[PDB]
């Protein structure tokens, strides 16, 4: 057809994007995305950003995002034009949940845009364009679409925690916390496994931040962390490259997790933590004996924490007598 005629009818479709129904959005978005050329890619994508509001509701949105994934699967320039549209934005209120979801979609789909998405994401976080409440709203109302690419989110989160800016570091911590809360059991174990690798890395700032996330995950979801105690306990094998301050924090999250609940699952880790400390206290190495004193005092504080029966009171008494004797 006539090139100008196609643009004119495309503009007519774009004009009423707000007043159309929800089911016809996938095909309409499919038509707009497919009927583009090289020079108008920047402008059509930019116009689509401000015009699309997205405000059977879940199913239509899922089918909407499924079309976009298929529409940009073989089109790299369209994805690059979307990031350029986001980067040019200079107002916080214009950034929206749909803006953040699309950034994760391009990251998971196209592997050639990883570095560009990362660099712009650092800039928006540093400038405050992307903020915790926007991230919280994104996960809260669109965790169905985000769940299919938890590994893509976690890879982004793990990379963000390697930075040197507290604003970026705090965002990467939240990306870990929200992934743990809103995803399934398998992606939760990846979150804990990723944190364990951060603690066993060697960077001071990385270790303390990951321990902060571990403590947070225990407090909000003790039940989900009780199933991951085996991986958290594995950090005790790498106490050589951990400072005494981080050892005390590591024993704090372990002890507060074991005594968080009183179910049969917690009784197994409760006695397992006792066994580890009883043999650090009795170790021949002086370094491990000092670690056992730190851990045993840390655990005794949580057992005796006031909110305790006589049998509970004699357990903390028994542990203290062990440290005093050793």
């Amino acid at each position: 057809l006539d090139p100008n005629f196609l643009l004119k009818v495309r503009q007519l479709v774009m004009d009423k994007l707000s007043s159309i129904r929800l089911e016809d959005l996938p095909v309409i978005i499919k038509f707009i995305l497919h009927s583009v050329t090289a020079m108008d890619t920047l402008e059509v994508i930019s116009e689509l950003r401000e015009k699309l509001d997205l405000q059977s509701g879940q199913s239509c949105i899922i089918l909407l995002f499924d079309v976009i994934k298929s529409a940009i699967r073989y089109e790299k320039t369209i994805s690059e034009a979307w990031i350029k549209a986001i980067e040019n934005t200079a107002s916080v209120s214009e950034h929206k949940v749909f803006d953040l979801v699309m950034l994760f979609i391009i990251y998971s789909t196209n592997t050639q845009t990883k570095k560009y998405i990362d660099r712009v994401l650092r800039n928006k976080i540093r400038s405050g364009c992307i903020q915790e409440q926007l991230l919280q709203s994104t996960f809260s109302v669109h965790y169905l679409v985000l769940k299919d690419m938890c590994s893509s989110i976690l890879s982004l989160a793990q990379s963000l925690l390697h930075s040197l800016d507290q604003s970026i570091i705090s965002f990467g911590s939240l990306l870990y916390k929200y992934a743990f809360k809103f995803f399934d059991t398998y992606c939760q174990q990846e979150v804990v496994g990723a944190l364990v690798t951060h603690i066993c890395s060697g960077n001071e700032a990385e270790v303390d931040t990951a321990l902060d996330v571990l403590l947070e995950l225990v407090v909000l979801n003790p039940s989900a962390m009780m199933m991951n105690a085996v991986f958290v306990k594995g950090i005790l094998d790498y106490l050589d490259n951990i400072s005494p301050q981080q050892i005390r924090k590591l024993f704090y999250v372990l002890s507060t997790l074991a005594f968080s609940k009183q179910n049969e699952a917690s009784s197994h880790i409760q006695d397992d933590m006792h066994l580890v400390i009883r043999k650090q206290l009795s170790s021949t190495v002086f370094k491990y004996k000092l670690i056992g004193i730190i851990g045993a005092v840390t655990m005794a504080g949580i057992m005796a924490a006031d909110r305790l029966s006589d049998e509970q009171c004699t357990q903390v008494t028994s542990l203290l007598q062990l440290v005093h004797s050793c």
Binding site: A38, Y74, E75, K76, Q112, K115, Q158, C200, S201, Y238
Partner: protein, 998 residues
């Protein structure tokens, strides 16, 4: 702390004595000890030890498979090195600082002799830690690019070759890292693939010279890495093909020629592709309808080796193509036509041999040829239905029917009847009605666009008919009679019957219709010229028809040209055949008929010019437009036949442009095209013209050398500048074939030097080309610093001195350097060559500086800088024009002083001072520095926003030189303090300038 270092060094010495199988346990313990103490020392010892093992193993392995002294078997050596690598990588996971030391120790611009097959393989597996993935892969990317720059610089300069002993390059190391990865190095493959794609992504062609070759070499390395990793490792070949298809299957229209070649090489191992990575090919097929036509044609040609052996892929493609053709959406039927053409152009046998609960059943039925014919006829009939579509689809079919009919001789009747039916729609059967072609039915009005390419329809008909009469004979008579009738009525048409000069405008509707109709008439005349040449053999009557057809073609061409293009429709085989008979035919019977064509000089020009177009198409696109225009073997054969005629006509008879001059232009284009594309066939190419490549090339070179002498023997006003420039261009291209270590090369250099020393032409362009040839030959022979020094003296003599009170003696070393060409032609040329000399010396100093043979290198460096000092000494006191000569000289003096500073800083590191270095310092202070100030004074004294930028830009060069001299003298104070010898006694006090306004 120091205790840990001492015990580590002791264990490093024990490495040699103990067994290799005990090394991995020692390294694991040594890495743990490294955590609480020294980290770089442990890593350096392990890397250095295993590199020596790799080097020793390579030397002892190289040789015959007889009894060899094998200290370590290759099988166990790779196993040990593999487990050492995994221990280091695992240690880095728990020790971040260990990873930083490894990157720092292996950080690259320098050769970085620490890099080795062991250290490269160590880095590739380190990429499995995402904390180090980007910086390690960036470290490797910079290493290979810098390595290729080293190789390029060494190859082009003879001065460096005599000095620098050959060293292994990072490109070679990585290739054998892939080779050694076959010993279960699965941890290296992941980073191996990413490095290959980074090299292709970062350094792929961007067509959308100094850096293009290393970029092309870097991109080719990525293809080699990916291809070799594909063959060896099965768990990674699925990822490689998916990433390759991602880059290829796009609508972005980015340059993907390098990825398409990698895809073609990968699919050569079709059983490897079908075994694991089989779904990716089918998914790419599903997207063929959405892709543009050009992408589909190139993608399908890339996967052609896969479809040749596999039926399932061919069957899946047919299903996709059939679905795409039936789709109402356009731009998908065009791809279906392209897909069905390619399948039918290449394969004689087409065809084979579901729901949730539906399965396929292996029916054991013998192949049926009759059923195959119906399968092919069904597609052929579908393609006939596409001849009523847009002219884009019609153009594809006309180009494809010739190859379809050659492949499937059983489709000859179907194709010919299809062509006949289309021709009847535009042919007037009336014996007396003019014109014989309805050019108004070929025009679609809705804006005016072309509907039927009538000229291309007859080209396909004429070629298909020609194949029919010589392939299946040992409707055709109807076609033979129509073409004769068309020829007669086109000749007797007076160009008024075609409704043609009435408007011929590029904007009005009638002008657009007239312009298109002009192209069709010329296109038809070319095809009919080709038809009448072959038919009736060499007959005078038919050749008179050709001449009459040419006049109709030429007359319409002149009208369109002066009121103001398109490719010629002659096949390259016909052009080669036409030229051979038109210039090199002496058979008695043919001479009578050929005298008709030879009598028209305009026809002579037309025949040669079309041959130049065919060669030009090869250079631009890599293939020729006409039939058999994508067959490299047949293009090369025509190139040899055309070259023989062009060589003969130019040399046998000397001299718009003349015929002999046009043959010279074609010769230059062919020589460039042959070397660019048919590199391995150069010996065959030179053989076909009428010993080795150097001996045959020298025979042609001497043959063009005599031609240049004839023009130079003529007068100044009669000097044919256009021909002389072409001869030097031909000589330059031919001289690229001579071996530098041969007497033939020496004769070529001696002849070029003699021509420059004796011939004085007033053509600036001729002098620039001649000097460029002389310098190109000289640099590959020896250092041109002595040549540069003599040329600078000529410029000084012709242009005078800035002192205005002294008289400079005219050396007249070279006659080509006269008062007109001395500036800005020769001066800018010699300055660019001295720039390359300084880049060579800067490269040597950088290597020596990082190295700590030194005494031979140091003497050569000082000898180069000593001679180049006298070259600059002549230029700084020459009255150069205020243009770019002064700008380039000031920039080059800054480079000279930067190079001197780099040499001085080298001795600061070494001298804890030889006589040659001292004399170089003395010479710089007595012959360059005081005269640089005089030149600065000379330049400055004599004389919207764009002007604002210009005036501020001119304030940069002189202060840049002042900093360079002061930086040079700053480090000479350091050297005099360190070496206890006063080097500042040779340097006078710096001279400063002040401004004062009149």
């Amino acid at each position: 702390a120091e205790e840990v270092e001492f015990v580590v060094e002791k264990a490093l010495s024990m490495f040699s004595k103990m067994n290799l199988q005990e090394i991995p346990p020692l390294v694991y313990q040594l890495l743990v000890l490294s955590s609480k103490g020294s980290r770089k020392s442990v890593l350096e010892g392990i890397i250095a030890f295993f590199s020596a093992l790799d080097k020793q193993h390579n030397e002892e392995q190289s040789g015959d498979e007889l009894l060899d002294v094998v200290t370590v078997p290759s099988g166990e050596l790779r196993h040990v090195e593999g487990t050492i690598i995994l221990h280091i990588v695992f240690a880095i996971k728990l020790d971040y600082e260990l990873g930083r030391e490894l990157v720092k120790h292996l950080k690259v611009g320098d050769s970085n002799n620490n890099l080795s097959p062991f250290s490269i393989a160590l880095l590739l597996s380190v990429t499995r830690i995402q904390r180090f993935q980007d910086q390690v892969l960036d470290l490797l990317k910079t290493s290979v690019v810098k390595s290729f720059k080293d190789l390029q610089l060494l190859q082009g300069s003879k001065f460096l070759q005599n000095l620098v002993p050959h060293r292994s390059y990072v490109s070679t190391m990585i290739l054998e890292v892939v080779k050694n990865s076959v010993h279960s190095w699965d941890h290296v493959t992941q980073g191996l693939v990413e490095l290959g794609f980074i090299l292709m992504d970062s350094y792929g062609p961007k067509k959308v010279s100094l850096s293009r070759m290393p970029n092309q070499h870097a991109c080719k390395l990525g293809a080699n890495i990916l291809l070799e990793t594909f063959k060896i490792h099965e768990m990674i070949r699925q990822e490689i093909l998916e990433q390759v298809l991602n880059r290829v299957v796009t609508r972005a229209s980015s340059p993907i020629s390098h990825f398409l070649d990698l895809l073609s090489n990968i699919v050569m191992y079709a059983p490897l592709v079908l075994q694991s990575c089989s779904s990716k090919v089918t998914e790419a097929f599903d997207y063929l309808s959405f892709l543009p036509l050009q992408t589909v044609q190139r993608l399908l040609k890339a996967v052609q080796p896969l479809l040749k052996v596999s039926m399932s892929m061919r069957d899946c493609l047919i299903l996709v193509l059939r679905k795409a053709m039936f789709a109402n959406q356009l731009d998908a039927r065009k791809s279906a036509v392209a897909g069905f053409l390619l399948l039918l152009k290449n394969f004689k046998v087409l065809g084979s041999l579901l729901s949730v609960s539906q399965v396929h059943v292996d029916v054991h039925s013998h192949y049926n040829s009759v059923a195959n014919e119906t399968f092919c006829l069904e597609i052929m009939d579908s393609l006939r239905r596409c001849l009523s579509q847009q002219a884009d689809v019609r153009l594809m079919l006309y180009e494809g029917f010739y190859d379809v009919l050659r492949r499937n001789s059983q489709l000859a009747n179907s194709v010919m009847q299809t062509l006949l039916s289309q021709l009847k729609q535009f042919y007037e059967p009336k014996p007396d009605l003019l014109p014989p072609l309805k050019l108004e039915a070929c025009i679609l009005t809705q804006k005016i666009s072309l509907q039927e390419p009538l000229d291309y329809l007859l080209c396909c008909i004429q070629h298909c008919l020609a194949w029919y009469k010589n392939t299946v004979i040992p409707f055709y008579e109807d076609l033979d009679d129509i073409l004769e009738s068309i020829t007669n009525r086109m000749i007797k048409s007076e160009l008024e019957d075609f409704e043609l000069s009435a408007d011929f405008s590029q904007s009005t509707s009638i002008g657009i219709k007239n312009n298109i109709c002009a192209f069709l008439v010329m296109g038809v005349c070319e095809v009919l010229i080709e038809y009448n040449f072959s038919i009736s053999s060499f007959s005078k009557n038919r050749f008179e028809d050709i001449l009459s057809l040419f006049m109709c073609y030429k007359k319409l061409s002149d009208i369109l040209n002066e009121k103001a293009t398109s490719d010629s429709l002659l096949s390259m085989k016909f052009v080669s055949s036409l030229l051979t008979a038109l210039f090199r035919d002496s058979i008695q019977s043919h001479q009578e008929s050929l005298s008709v064509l030879r009598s028209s000089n305009e026809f002579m020009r037309y025949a040669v010019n079309v041959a130049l177009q065919k060669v030009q198409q090869l250079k631009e696109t890599g293939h020729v437009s006409g039939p058999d225009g994508q067959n490299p073997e047949k293009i090369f054969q025509n190139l040899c036949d055309i070259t023989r005629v062009l060589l003969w006509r130019y040399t046998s008879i000397p001299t718009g442009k003349s015929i002999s001059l046009l043959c010279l232009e074609g010769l230059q284009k062919i020589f460039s095209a042959v070397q660019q594309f048919y590199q391995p066939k150069i010996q065959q190419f030179l053989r076909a013209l009428d010993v080795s490549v150097t001996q045959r090339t020298a025979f042609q070179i001497r043959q063009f050398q005599r031609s240049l002498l004839n023009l130079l023997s003529s007068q100044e006003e009669d000097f044919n500048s256009k021909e002389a420039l072409l001869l030097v261009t031909v000589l330059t291209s031919l001289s690229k074939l001579l071996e530098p270590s041969s007497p033939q090369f020496v004769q070529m250099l001696s002849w070029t030097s003699k021509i420059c020393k004796e011939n004085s032409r007033e053509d600036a362009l001729f002098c620039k080309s001649l000097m460029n040839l002389l310098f190109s030959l000289h640099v590959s022979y020896k250092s041109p610093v002595i040549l540069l020094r003599d040329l600078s003296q000529d410029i000084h003599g012709h242009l005078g001195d800035i002192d205005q009170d002294v008289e400079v003696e005219k050396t007249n070393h070279f006659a080509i350097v006269n008062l007109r060409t001395a500036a800005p032609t020769v001066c800018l040329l010699v300055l660019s060559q001295a720039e390359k000399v300084l880049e060579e010396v800067d490269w040597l100093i950088t290597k020596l500086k990082g190295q700590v043979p030194n005494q031979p290198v140091e003497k050569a460096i000082i000898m180069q800088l000593g001679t180049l000092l006298t070259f600059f000494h002549e230029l700084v006191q020459t009255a150069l024009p205020s243009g770019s000569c002064v700008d380039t000289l000031l920039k080059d003096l800054c480079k000279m002083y930067t190079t001197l500073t780099a040499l001085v800083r080298y001795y600061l590191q070494v001298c804890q001072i030889p006589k040659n270095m001292e004399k170089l310092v003395k010479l710089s202070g007595s012959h360059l520095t005081p005269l640089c100030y005089s030149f600065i004074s000379y330049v400055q004294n004599k004389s919207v926003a764009t002007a604002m930028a210009r005036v501020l830009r001119e304030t940069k060069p002189i202060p840049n030189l002042i900093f360079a001299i002061e930086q040079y003298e700053k480090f000479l104070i350091h050297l005099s303090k360190k070496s206890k010898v006063n080097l500042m006694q040779h340097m006078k006090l710096s001279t400063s300038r002040d401004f004062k306004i009149k």
